[PDB]
């Protein structure tokens, strides 16, 4: 294994080549791969060494090599918690996120949101809103998932993006619809009326994403438990209708939800149990 006897000190010393010009993109990408491998093996980088290696990596942004650029985004994400002054890449990542190359835009959004603190989030808000409504599914999904992570640090800022997330929830892309619905739920989670209005909107129009269906079943089951379990609820009819879904994942989630509902009668359990019985014979 060419990576088996990697020592931290040797690899960090090889990273000094990032200060040289011209850059060899293959050699530098391989050194970044060694750094990522060391971090992945659980080697502890000291704050000073991580910061020097991070600032050495920032100099690789002079190269236009696409593989090297992606390895830089990955390195930014992995070093974001261990290096100081990581904010230095913010301008480069906002440029790549708004760039013409769709292959950079999604990874650049993810890397930007990993280094963006609560104080800097307002400076990137415009670009995040544009990325959420982007036509490219990879960009839209990356922006939605990044917005979910930012919800922990800056709930009040991300709450302003509900309209853009709601537009993304109408996407035909299975993953974009899942991430948009998930983000909308996490923002609205504490507002019972907003959750009920979300469920009623998506039950009426349907979902295309099997993952979004599984999440909606969990949202509907939780709402049904909080409403003292009136079984004549349109929420129960929605969960029961999901037992007829074309995706095994959704059928299983619906059966699991019905079974875990408090106060269910033997008649209401019967369809869910019959589906679970059919799954016991699955290959």
């Amino acid at each position: 294994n060419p990576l088996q006897h990697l020592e931290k000190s040797a690899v960090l010393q090889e990273a000094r080549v990032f200060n040289e010009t011209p850059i060899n993109p293959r050699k530098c990408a391989h050194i970044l791969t060694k750094i990522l491998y060391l971090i992945n093996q659980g080697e502890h980088l000291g704050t000073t060494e991580a910061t020097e290696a991070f600032f050495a990596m920032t100099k690789l942004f002079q190269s236009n090599d696409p593989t090297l650029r992606r390895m830089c985004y990955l390195t930014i994400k992995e070093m974001s918690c261990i290096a100081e002054d990581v904010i230095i890449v913010t301008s480069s990542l906002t440029k790549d996120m708004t760039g013409k190359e769709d292959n950079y835009r999604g990874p650049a959004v993810r890397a930007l949101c990993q280094i963006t603190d609560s104080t800097m989030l307002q400076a990137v808000e415009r670009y995040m809103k544009q990325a959420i409504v982007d036509k490219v599914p990879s960009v839209s999904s990356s922006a939605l998932v990044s917005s979910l992570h930012l919800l922990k640090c800056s709930f009040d800022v991300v709450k302003r993006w509900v309209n853009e997330a709601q537009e993304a929830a109408s996407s035909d892309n299975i993953m974009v619809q899942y991430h948009a619905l998930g983000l909308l739920y996490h923002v609205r989670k504490n507002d019972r009326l907003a959750v009920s209005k979300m469920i009623s909107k998506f039950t009426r129009h349907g979902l295309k994403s099997p993952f979004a269906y599984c999440m909606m079943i969990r949202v509907a089951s939780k709402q049904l438990e909080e409403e003292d379990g009136s079984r004549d609820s349109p929420l129960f009819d929605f969960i029961e209708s999901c037992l007829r879904n074309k995706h095994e994942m959704v059928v299983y989630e619906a059966a699991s939800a019905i079974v875990n509902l408090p106060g269910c009668s033997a008649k209401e359990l019967a369809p869910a149990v019959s589906v679970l019985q059919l799954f016991c014979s699955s290959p």
């Binding site: 990576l3 659980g42 994400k77 993810r110 993953m175 899942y178 998930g182 969990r218 994942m249």
Partner: protein
């Protein structure tokens, strides 16, 4: 269970000795590297002799698949949908199978660790399932111009 997009707790790739080739923990269930390695070794010791694809270990649902010299694990809550965890495991394994030209082995994986890190980052983000289609993952990782 409170409905959440956070489904995956950990992804592990262990070798035949139970040593960590790849590990990513997405929650604070195992905060220390020592506890993580103890958990990995405990999972390996309970799974390496069994042809079963699913286990309950330490109160967590562990879905796993063996290859030639590798063990792939996707770990979720005991309350999570087991088929959703299987979709992540299959997506990871099939993505690596396509990337490594069907030779999913320790040697081929170590030669292409950059591809592994990029593939996992396309499948799961912070414990959220990002992509479940292995073809989409491979297409996003296959950036070698």
């Amino acid at each position: 269970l409170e409905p959440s997009l956070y489904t995956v707790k950990a992804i592990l790739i262990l070798d035949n000795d139970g040593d960590r080739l790849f590990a990513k923990y997405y929650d604070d269930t195992y905060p220390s590297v020592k506890e993580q390695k103890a958990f990995e070794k405990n999972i390996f010791n309970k799974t390496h002799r069994t042809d079963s694809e699913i286990a309950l270990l330490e109160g967590l649902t562990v879905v796993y698949k063996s290859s030639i010299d590798l063990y792939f694990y996707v770990i979720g809550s005991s309350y999570e949908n087991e088929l959703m965890l299987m979709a992540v495991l299959n997506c990871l394994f099939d993505s690596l199978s396509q990337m490594l030209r069907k030779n999913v082995e320790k040697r081929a994986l170590l030669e292409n660790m950059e591809g592994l890190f990029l593939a996992v980052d396309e499948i799961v983000d912070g414990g959220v399932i990002l992509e479940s289609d292995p073809q989409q993952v491979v297409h996003r990782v296959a950036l070698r111009g």
